[PDB]
Each structure stands twice: as structure tokens, then as C-alpha cells.
Amino acid sequence: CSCQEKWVGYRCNCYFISSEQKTWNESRHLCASQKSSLLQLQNTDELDFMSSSQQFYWIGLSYSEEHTAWLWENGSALSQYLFPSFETFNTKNCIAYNPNGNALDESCEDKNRYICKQQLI
């Protein structure tokens, strides 16, 4: 399950954990730019390794008034028991996440780091 240059492999998946801080719509595009996409958490334990990092990251979850629901990049709804805070998330924000499970919602125009992930050959 080999991956491209500065990409990290785990569970036969390729992840990209950026150093630069960008906008959620940018990163969104940078990942897309690389045939990958703004992280869709298949579960809280997707980043075992990064286990501690006390910093948040941008992820592919964003609200969507058209389906009155939070959605991942491919349009799957957000599981209600995934993130707990859930109900707090101010629909006008993006979702930032922390390897240790914690997750925030900050202006989609802030400047956090991003995480792309190539999932299927």
C-alpha cells in the first residue's frame, strides 16, 4: 500500500498532514488537487499514531442546508455518535479535529492545518 512523497501510510491508507495553515476551502482544494480529500473520519481511532498532538486540523466535514445535515466531502451524513459536541457546531463553521478525538468548529476562513487521505486505488 505504497504512497506518494511526503505522505504517511497507515491501515493501507495514505494521509497527508500539512505544515502550512490554510483556509478550509483552500485545503479542501489542495487535497482535491492531489487526487485525495479533506479527511473523512471512519472513526475516532483513525489517527492512532498522531495519538497526542495538542493541535487541531481541518477535516472534510461541513454543514449543508440542502440536506439539513453535516456532511463529509462525498456527501455521507455525519454519524451522530461520532463527535459528541455535535449539537454545538455552529452550522456556519468548519470542523477542526484533534488526533486525540477532541473536535472544534471555527470560521471556515480561519487558518488551521489540513489532512488529506487517499482511500481506494
UniProtKB/Swiss-Prot annotation:
GO terms for molecular function: carbohydrate binding; HLA-E specific inhibitory MHC class Ib receptor activity; MHC class I protein complex binding; MHC class Ib protein binding, via antigen binding groove; protein antigen binding; transmembrane signaling receptor activity. Changing residue 54 to A: Abolishes binding to HLA-E. Changing residue 106 to A: Impairs binding to HLA-E. Glycans are attached at residues 25, 74. Residues 1-121 are extracellular. Disulfide bonds join 3-14, 31-116, 94-108. Expressed in NK cell subsets (at protein level). Expressed in memory/effector CD8-positive alpha-beta T cell subsets (at protein level). Expressed in melanoma-specific cytotoxic T cell clones (at protein level). Expressed in terminally differentiated cytotoxic gamma-delta T cells (at protein level). KLRD1-KLRC1 and KLRD1-KLRC2 are differentially expressed in NK and T cell populations, with only minor subsets expressing both receptor complexes (at protein level). It is a single-pass type II membrane protein. Signal peptide: none annotated. Changing residue 88 to A: Has no impact on the affinity for HLA-E. Can form disulfide-bonded heterodimer with NKG2 family members KLRC1 and KLRC2. KLRD1-KLRC1 heterodimer interacts with peptide-bound HLA-E-B2M heterotrimeric complex. KLRD1 plays a prominent role in directly interacting with HLA-E. KLRD1-KLRC1 interacts with much higher affinity with peptide-bound HLA-E-B2M than KLRD1-KLRC2. Interacts with the adapter protein TYROBP/DAP12; this interaction is required for cell surface expression and cell activation. Immune receptor involved in self-nonself discrimination. In complex with KLRC1 or KLRC2 on cytotoxic and regulatory lymphocyte subsets, recognizes non-classical major histocompatibility (MHC) class Ib molecule HLA-E loaded with self-peptides derived from the signal sequence of classical MHC class Ia and non-classical MHC class Ib molecules. Enables cytotoxic cells to monitor the expression of MHC class I molecules in healthy cells and to tolerate self. Primarily functions as a ligand binding subunit as it lacks the capacity to signal. This is Natural killer cells antigen CD94. The lineage of its organism: Eukaryota, Metazoa, Chordata, Craniata, Vertebrata. The chain holds residues 59 to 179 of 179 of the full protein.
